[PDB]
Coordinates of C-alpha atoms and ligand atoms in Angstrom, one line a residue:
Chain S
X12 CA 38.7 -31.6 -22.1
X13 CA 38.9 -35.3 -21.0
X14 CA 39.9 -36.5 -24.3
X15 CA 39.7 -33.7 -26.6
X16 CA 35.9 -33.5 -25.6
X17 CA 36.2 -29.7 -24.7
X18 CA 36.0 -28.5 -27.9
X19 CA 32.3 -29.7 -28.3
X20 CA 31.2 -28.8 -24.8
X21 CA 32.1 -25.3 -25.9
X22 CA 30.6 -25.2 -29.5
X23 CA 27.7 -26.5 -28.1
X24 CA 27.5 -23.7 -25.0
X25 CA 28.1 -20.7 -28.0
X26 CA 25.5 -22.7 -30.1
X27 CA 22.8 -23.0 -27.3
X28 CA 23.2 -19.1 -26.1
X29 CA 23.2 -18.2 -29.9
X30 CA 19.9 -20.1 -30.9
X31 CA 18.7 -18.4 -28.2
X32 CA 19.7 -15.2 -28.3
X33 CA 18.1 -15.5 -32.0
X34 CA 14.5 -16.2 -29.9
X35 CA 14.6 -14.1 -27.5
X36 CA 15.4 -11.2 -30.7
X37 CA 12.8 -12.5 -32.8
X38 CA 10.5 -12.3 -29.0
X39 CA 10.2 -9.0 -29.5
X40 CA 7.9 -8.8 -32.5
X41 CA 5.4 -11.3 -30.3
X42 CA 1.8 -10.3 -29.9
X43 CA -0.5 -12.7 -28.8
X44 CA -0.3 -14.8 -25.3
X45 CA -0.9 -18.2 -26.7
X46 CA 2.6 -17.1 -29.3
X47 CA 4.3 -16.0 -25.8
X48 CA 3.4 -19.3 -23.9
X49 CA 5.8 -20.9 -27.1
X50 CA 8.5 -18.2 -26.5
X51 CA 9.1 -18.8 -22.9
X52 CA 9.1 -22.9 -23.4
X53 CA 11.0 -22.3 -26.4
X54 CA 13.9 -19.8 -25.2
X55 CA 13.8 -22.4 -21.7
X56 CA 14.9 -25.4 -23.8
X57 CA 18.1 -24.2 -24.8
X58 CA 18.3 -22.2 -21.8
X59 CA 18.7 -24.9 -19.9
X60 CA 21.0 -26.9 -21.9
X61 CA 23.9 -24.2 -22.1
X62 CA 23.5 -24.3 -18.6
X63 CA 24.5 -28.0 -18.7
X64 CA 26.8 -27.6 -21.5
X65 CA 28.7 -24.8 -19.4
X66 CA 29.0 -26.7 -16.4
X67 CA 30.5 -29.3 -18.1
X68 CA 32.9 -27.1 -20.1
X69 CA 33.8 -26.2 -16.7
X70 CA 34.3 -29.4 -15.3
X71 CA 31.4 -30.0 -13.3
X72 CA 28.8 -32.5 -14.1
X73 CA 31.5 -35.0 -14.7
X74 CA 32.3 -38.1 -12.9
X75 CA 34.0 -41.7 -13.6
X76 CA 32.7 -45.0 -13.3
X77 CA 34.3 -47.8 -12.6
X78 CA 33.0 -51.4 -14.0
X79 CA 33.1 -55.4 -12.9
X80 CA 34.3 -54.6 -17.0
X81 CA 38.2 -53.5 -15.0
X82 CA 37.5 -50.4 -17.3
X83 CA 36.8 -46.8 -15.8
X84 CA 34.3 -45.0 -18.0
X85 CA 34.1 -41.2 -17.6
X86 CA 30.7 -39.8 -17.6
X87 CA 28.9 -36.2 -18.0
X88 CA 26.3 -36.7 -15.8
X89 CA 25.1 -33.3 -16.3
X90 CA 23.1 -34.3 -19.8
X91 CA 20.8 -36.7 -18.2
X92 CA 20.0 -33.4 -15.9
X93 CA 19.5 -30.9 -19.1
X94 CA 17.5 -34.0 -21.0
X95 CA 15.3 -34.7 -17.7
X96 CA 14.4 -31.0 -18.2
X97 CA 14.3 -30.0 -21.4
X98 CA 13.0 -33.3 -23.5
X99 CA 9.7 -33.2 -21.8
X100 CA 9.4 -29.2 -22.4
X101 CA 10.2 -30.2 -26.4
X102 CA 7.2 -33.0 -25.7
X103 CA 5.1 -29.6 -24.3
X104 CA 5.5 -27.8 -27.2
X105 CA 4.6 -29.6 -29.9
X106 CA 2.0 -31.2 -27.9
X107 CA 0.4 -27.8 -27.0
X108 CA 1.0 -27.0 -31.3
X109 CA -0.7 -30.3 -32.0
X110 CA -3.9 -29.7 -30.2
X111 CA -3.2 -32.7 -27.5
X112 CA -4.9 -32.8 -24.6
X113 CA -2.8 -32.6 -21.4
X114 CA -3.2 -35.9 -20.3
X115 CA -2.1 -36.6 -23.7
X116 CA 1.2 -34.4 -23.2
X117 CA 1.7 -35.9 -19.5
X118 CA 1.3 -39.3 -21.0
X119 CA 4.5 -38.8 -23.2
X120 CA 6.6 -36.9 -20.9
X121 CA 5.9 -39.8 -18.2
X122 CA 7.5 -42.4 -20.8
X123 CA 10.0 -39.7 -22.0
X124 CA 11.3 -39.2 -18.2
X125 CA 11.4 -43.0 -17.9
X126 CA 13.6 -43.0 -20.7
X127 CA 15.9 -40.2 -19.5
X128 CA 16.4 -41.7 -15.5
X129 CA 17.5 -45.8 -17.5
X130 CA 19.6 -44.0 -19.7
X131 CA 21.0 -42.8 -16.7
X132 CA 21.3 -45.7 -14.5
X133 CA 22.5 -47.7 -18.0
X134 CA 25.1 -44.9 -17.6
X135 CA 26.4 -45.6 -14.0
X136 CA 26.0 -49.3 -13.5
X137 CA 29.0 -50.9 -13.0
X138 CA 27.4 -54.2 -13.6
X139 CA 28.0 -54.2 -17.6
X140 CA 25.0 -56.3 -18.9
X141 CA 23.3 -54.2 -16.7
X142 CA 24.2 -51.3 -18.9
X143 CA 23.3 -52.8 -21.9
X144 CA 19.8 -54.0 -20.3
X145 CA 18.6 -50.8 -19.0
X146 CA 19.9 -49.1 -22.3
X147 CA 17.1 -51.5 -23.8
X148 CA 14.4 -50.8 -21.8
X149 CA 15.4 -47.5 -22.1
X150 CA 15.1 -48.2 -26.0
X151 CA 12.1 -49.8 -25.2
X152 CA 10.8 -47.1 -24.0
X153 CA 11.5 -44.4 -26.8
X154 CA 10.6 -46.5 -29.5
X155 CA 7.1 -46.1 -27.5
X156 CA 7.5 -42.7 -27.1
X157 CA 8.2 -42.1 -30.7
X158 CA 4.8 -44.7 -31.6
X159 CA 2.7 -41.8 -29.2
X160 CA 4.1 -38.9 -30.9
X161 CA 3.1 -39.9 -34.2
X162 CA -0.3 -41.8 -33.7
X163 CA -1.7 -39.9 -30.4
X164 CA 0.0 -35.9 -31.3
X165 CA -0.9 -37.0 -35.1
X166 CA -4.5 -37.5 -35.0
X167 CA -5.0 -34.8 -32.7
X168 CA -3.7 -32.2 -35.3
X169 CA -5.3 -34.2 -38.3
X170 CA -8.2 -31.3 -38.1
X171 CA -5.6 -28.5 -38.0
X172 CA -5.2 -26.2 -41.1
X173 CA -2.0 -26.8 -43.1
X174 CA 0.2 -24.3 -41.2
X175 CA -0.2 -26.3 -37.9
X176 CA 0.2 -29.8 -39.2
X177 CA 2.7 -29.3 -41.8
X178 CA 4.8 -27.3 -39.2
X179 CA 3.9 -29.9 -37.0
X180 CA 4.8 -32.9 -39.5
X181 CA 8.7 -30.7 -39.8
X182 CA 8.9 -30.9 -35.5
X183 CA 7.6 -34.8 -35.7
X184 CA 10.0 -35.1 -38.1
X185 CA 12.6 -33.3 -36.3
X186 CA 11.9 -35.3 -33.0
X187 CA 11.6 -38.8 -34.7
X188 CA 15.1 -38.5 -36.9
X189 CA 17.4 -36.9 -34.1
X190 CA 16.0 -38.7 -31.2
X191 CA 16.4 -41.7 -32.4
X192 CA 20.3 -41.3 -32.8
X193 CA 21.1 -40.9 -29.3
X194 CA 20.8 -43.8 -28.3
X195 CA 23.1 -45.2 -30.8
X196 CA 25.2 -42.7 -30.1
X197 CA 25.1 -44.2 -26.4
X198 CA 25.6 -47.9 -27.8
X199 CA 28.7 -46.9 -29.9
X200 CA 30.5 -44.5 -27.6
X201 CA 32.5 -45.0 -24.2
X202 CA 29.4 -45.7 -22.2
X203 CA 28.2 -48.4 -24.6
X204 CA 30.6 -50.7 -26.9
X205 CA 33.1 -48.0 -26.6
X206 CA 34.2 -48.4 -29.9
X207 CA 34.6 -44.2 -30.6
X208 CA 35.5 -42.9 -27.3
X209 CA 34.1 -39.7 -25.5
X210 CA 35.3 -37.6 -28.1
X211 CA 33.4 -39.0 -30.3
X212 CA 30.4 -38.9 -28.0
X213 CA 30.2 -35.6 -27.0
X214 CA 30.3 -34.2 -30.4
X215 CA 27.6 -36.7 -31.4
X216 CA 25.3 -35.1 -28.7
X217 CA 26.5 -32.0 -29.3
X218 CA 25.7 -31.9 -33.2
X219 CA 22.6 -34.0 -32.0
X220 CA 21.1 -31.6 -28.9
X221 CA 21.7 -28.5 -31.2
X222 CA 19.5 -30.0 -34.3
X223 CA 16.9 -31.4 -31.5
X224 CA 16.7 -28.0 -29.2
X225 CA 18.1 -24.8 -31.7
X226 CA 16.5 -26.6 -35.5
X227 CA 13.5 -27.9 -33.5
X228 CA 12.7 -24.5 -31.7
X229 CA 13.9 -22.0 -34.4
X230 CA 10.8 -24.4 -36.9
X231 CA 8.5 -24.0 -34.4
X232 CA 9.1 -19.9 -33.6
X233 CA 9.2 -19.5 -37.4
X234 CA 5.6 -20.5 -37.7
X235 CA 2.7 -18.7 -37.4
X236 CA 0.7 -22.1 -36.1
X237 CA 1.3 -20.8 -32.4
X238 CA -0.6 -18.0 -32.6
X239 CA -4.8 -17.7 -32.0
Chain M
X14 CA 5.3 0.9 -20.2
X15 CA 6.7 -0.8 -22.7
X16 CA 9.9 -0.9 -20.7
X17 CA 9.9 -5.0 -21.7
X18 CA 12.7 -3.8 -24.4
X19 CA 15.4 -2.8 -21.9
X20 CA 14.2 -6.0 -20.3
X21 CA 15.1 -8.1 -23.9
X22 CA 18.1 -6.0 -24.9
X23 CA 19.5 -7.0 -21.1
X24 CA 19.0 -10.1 -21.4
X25 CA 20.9 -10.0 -24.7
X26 CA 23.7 -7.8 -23.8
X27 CA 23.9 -10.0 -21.1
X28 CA 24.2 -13.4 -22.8
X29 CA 26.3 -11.4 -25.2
X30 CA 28.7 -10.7 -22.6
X31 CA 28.1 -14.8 -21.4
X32 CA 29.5 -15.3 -24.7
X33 CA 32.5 -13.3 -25.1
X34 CA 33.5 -14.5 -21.3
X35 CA 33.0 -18.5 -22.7
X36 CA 34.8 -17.6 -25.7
X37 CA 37.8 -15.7 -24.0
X38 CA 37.5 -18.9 -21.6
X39 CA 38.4 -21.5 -23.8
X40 CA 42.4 -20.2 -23.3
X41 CA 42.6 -20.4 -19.8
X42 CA 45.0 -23.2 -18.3
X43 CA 45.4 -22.2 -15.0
X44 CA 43.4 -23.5 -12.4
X45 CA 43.3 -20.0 -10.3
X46 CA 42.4 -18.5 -13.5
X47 CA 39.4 -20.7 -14.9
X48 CA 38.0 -19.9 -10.9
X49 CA 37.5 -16.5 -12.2
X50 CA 35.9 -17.2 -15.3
X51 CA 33.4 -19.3 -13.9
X52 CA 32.5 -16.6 -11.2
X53 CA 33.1 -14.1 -13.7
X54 CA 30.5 -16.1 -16.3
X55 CA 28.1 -16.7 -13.8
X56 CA 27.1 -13.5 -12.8
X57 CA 26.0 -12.2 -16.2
X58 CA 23.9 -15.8 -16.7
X59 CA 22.0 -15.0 -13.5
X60 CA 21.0 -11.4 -14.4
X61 CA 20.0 -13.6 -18.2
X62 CA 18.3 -15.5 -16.4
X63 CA 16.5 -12.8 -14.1
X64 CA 15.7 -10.3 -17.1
X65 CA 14.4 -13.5 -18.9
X66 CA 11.5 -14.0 -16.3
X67 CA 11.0 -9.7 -16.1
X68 CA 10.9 -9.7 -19.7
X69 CA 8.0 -12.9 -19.9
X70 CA 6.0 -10.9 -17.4
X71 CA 7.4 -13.7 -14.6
X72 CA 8.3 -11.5 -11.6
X73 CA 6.9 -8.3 -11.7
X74 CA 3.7 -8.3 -9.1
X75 CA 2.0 -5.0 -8.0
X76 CA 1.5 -3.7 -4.4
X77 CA -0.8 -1.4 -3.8
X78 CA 0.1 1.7 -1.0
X79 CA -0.8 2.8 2.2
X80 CA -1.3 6.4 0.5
X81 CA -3.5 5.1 -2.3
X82 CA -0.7 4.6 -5.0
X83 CA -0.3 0.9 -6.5
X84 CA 3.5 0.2 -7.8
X85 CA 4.6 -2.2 -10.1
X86 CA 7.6 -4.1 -8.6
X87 CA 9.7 -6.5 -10.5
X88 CA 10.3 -8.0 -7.6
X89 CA 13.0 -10.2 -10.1
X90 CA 15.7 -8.1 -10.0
X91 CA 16.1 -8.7 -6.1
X92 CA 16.6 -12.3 -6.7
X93 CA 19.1 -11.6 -9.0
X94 CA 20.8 -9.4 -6.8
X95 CA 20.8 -11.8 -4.2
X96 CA 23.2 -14.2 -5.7
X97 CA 25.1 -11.8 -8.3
X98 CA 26.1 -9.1 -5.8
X99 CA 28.0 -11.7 -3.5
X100 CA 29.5 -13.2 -6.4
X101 CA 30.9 -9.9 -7.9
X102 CA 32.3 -9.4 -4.2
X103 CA 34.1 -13.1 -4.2
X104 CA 35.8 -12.1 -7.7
X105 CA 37.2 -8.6 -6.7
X106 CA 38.2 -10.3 -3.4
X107 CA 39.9 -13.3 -4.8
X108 CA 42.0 -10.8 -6.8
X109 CA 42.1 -8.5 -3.9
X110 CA 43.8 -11.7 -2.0
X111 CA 41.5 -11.3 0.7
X112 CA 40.4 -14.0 3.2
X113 CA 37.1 -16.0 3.6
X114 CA 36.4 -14.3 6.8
X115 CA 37.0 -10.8 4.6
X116 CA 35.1 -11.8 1.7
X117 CA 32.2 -13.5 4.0
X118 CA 32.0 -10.5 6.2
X119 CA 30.9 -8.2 3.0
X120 CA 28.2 -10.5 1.8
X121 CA 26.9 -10.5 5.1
X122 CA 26.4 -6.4 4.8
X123 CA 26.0 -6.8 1.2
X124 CA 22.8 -9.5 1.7
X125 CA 21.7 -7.7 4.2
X126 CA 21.6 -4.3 2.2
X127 CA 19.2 -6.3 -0.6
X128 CA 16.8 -7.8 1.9
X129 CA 16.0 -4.7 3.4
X130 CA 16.0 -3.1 -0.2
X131 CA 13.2 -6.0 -1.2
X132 CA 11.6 -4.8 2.4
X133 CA 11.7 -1.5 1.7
X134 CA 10.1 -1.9 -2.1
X135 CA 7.1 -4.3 -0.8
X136 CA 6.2 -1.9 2.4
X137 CA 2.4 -0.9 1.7
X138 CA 3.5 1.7 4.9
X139 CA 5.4 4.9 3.3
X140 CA 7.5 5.9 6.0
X141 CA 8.7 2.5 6.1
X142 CA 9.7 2.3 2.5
X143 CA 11.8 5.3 3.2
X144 CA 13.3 4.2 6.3
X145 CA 14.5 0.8 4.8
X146 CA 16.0 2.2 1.4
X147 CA 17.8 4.5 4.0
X148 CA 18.9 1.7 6.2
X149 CA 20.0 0.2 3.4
X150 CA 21.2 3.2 1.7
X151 CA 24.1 3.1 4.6
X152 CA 24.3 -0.4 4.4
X153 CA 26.3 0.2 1.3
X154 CA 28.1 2.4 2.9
X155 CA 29.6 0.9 5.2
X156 CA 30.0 -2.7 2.6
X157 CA 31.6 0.0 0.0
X158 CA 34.6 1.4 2.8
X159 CA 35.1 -1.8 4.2
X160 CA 35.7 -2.8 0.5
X161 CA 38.2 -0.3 -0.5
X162 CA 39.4 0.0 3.2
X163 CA 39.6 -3.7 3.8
X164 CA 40.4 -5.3 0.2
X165 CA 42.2 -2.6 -1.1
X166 CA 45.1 -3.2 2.2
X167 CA 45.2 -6.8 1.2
X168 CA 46.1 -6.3 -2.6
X169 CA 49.0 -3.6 -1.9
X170 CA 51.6 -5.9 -1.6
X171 CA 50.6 -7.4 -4.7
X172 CA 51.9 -7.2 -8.2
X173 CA 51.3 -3.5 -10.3
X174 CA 49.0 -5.1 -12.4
X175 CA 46.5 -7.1 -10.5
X176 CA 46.6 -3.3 -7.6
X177 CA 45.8 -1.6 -11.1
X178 CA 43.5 -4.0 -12.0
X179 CA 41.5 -4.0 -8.4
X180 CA 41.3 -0.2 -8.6
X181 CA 39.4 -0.2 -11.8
X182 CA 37.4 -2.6 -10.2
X183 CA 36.9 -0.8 -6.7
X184 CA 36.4 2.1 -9.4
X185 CA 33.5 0.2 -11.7
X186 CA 32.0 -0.8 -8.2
X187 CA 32.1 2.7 -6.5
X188 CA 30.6 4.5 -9.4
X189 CA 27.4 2.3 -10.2
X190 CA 26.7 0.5 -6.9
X191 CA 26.2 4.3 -5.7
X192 CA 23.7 5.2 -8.7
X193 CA 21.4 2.2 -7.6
X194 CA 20.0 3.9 -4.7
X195 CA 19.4 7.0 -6.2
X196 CA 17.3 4.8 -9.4
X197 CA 15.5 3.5 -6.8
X198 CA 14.7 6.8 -5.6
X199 CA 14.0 8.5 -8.4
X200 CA 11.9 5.8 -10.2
X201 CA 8.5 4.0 -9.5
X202 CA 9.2 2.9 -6.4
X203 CA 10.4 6.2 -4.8
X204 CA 9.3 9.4 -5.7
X205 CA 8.2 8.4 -9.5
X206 CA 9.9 11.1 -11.6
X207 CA 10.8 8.4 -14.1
X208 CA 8.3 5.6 -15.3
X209 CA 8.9 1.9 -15.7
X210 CA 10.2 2.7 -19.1
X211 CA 13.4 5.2 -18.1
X212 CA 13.9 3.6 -14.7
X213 CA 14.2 -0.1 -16.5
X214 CA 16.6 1.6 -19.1
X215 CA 19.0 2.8 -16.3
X216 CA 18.9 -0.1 -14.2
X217 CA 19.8 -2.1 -17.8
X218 CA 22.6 0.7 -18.3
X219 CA 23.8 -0.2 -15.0
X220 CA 23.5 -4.1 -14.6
X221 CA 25.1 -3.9 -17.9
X222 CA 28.1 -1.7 -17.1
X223 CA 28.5 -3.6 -13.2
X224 CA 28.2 -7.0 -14.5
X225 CA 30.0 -7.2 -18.3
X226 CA 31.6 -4.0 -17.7
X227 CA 33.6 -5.3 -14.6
X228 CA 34.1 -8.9 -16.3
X229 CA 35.4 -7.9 -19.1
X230 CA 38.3 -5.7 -17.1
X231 CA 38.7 -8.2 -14.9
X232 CA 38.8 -11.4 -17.6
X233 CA 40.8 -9.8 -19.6
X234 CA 43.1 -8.5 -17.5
X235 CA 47.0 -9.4 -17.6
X236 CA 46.4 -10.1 -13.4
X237 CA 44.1 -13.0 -14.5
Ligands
MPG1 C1 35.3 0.6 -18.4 C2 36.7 0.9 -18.9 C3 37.8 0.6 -17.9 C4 37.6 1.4 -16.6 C5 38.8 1.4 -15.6 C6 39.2 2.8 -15.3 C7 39.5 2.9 -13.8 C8 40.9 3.3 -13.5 C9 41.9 2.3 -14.0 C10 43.2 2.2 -13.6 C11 43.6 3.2 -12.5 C12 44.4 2.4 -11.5 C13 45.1 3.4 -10.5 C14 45.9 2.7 -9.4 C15 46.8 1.6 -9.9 C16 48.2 1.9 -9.4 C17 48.5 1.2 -8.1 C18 48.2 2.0 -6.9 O1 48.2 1.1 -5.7 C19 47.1 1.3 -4.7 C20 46.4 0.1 -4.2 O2 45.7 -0.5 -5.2 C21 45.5 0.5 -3.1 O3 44.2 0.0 -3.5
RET2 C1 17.1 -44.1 -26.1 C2 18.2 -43.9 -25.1 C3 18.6 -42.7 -24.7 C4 18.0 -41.5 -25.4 C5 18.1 -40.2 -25.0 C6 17.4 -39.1 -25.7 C7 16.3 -39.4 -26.8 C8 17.8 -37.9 -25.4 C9 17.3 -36.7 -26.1 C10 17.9 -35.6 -25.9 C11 17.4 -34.3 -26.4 C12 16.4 -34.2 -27.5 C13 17.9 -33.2 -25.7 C14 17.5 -31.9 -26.2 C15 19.7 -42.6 -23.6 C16 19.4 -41.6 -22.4 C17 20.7 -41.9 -24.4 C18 20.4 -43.9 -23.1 C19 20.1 -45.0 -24.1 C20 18.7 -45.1 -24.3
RET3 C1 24.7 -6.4 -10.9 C2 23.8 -5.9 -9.8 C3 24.2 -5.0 -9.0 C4 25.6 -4.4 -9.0 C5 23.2 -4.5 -8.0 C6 23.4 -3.6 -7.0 C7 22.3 -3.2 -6.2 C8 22.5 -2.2 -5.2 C9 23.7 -1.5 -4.9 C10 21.3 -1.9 -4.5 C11 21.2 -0.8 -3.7 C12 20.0 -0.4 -2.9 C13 20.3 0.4 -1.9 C14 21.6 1.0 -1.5 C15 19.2 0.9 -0.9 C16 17.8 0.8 -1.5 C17 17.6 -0.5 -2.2 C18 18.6 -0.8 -3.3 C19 18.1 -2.0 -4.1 C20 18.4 0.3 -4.3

């Protein structure tokens, strides 16, 4: 790619169209509209993201910034895009598997979007402390998102049978250990302290987005807690 | 039906063929070349992305007829159509070596052969329905000549192998663009002497062959 970059961009396109080629297979043997409604958010998420990941593969979604820094950064624009879509649908379905009420769901994906569009401007700022603050507010923001997935998704489930909340305790799980990576990921690659470059980067949010999109969804479709 | 397999196993075969095409992509170093694989890849992602919304239920409405009858239309595949048949025109024309007044031209008969299509399946009014698939019917016509008439002068100075190559691909286009009217015909929206189930099989048989089919000839071809 850019830097040797390419690789991932490409691993990570096969690995989204494979996790969902494996739910749109296992779609078949579905049988109940509430199951469905988890199916078609589901096979969306990483839909979407081999979309992204293939532009970029490509070439597209890719721009450079220059900083006040002297230093040109190079940036996939194109994730921020993917994320903006896909984390709030991840924020649907467990949300819609944990009993929340939509305000409830809305409520998360409002913070969640926040977080996504200052990642993004911590991403293109030229202005370098400006980078690192609106990566912290951005920080700020998921750690609160992560608090209301936990307390608020968490209590409304607490009167689910085991099924539902244990699967629900695996996605939580899921959600809280890979999400919480990215933006350390961010910190430590060319965007942040650039101490790995984007080679590094990339394959971070590669190995990262597959866990968070294909594990996630392929827990959630194996589970018989979205059916009724 | 239960014609919602086809519309799962095309969407598969489709991203299947996605895949191959990304993988096959990855060796590609010319700049002329990677231009056809992203064409080339794009074409069976929309038709993944239109069975996807056929196979949810998403796209697939119901008009009801003048003479009584009430069709089920997935309306989906027209949208998919839409894009996908202009962008299978831009990749034999590129190879072709034909001009953006040659290329344009065709999608201009080639969109306008879909819309009347999509006008022809919604029409409540029978002898209308007949009228536009015929319109439409000619449409193709005229966009298939110009095609081998038109294309196939500006790739015969060309090298062997991308003139070979075109001809299969003239050859891929000739033979299943010309079955679509005739599914049409045959199937729900026409005369109904297949159901949703047999008609959704063929039209999966020949997205399949007209999308993946003509990519792989074309992608892995010596030309590109
Ligand atoms: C699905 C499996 C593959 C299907 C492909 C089979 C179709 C036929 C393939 C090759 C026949 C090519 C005949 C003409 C090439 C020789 C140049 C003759 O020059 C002539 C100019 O091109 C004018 O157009
Ligand atoms: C906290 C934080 C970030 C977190 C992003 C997240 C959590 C992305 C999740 C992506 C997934 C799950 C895709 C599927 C940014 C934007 C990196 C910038 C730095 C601040
Ligand atoms: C990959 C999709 C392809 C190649 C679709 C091709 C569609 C056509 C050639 C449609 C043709 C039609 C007519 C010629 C008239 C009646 C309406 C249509 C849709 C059947």
């Amino acid at each position: 790619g850019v830097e040797g970059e390419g690789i991932w961009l490409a691993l990570g396109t096969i690995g989204m169209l494979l996790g969902m080629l494996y739910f749109i297979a296992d779609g078949l043997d579905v049988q109940d509209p509430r199951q469905k409604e988890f199916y078609v958010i589901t096979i969306l998420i990483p839909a979407i993201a081999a979309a992204s990941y293939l532009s970029m593969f490509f070439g597209f979604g890719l721009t450079e910034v220059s900083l006040a820094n002297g230093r040109v950064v190079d940036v996939y624009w194109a994730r921020y895009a993917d994320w903006l879509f896909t984390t709030p649908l991840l924020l649907l379905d467990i949300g819609l598997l944990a009993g929340a009420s939509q305000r409830d769901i809305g409520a998360l994906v409002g913070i969640d979007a926040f977080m996504i569009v200052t990642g993004l401007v911590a991403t293109l700022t030229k202005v370098v402390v400006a980078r690192y603050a609106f990566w912290t507010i951005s920080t700020i923001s998921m750690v609160f998102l992560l608090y209301y997935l936990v307390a608020v998704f968490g209590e409304a489930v607490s009167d689910a049978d085991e099924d539902t909340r244990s699967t629900f305790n695996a996605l939580r799980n899921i959600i809280l250990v890979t999400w919480a990576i990215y933006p350390v990921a961010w910190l430590v690659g060319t965007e942040g302290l650039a101490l790995t470059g984007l080679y590094g980067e990339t394959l971070l949010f590669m190995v990262l987005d597959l866990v968070a999109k294909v594990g996630f969804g392929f827990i959630l479709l194996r589970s018989r807690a979205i059916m009724g």
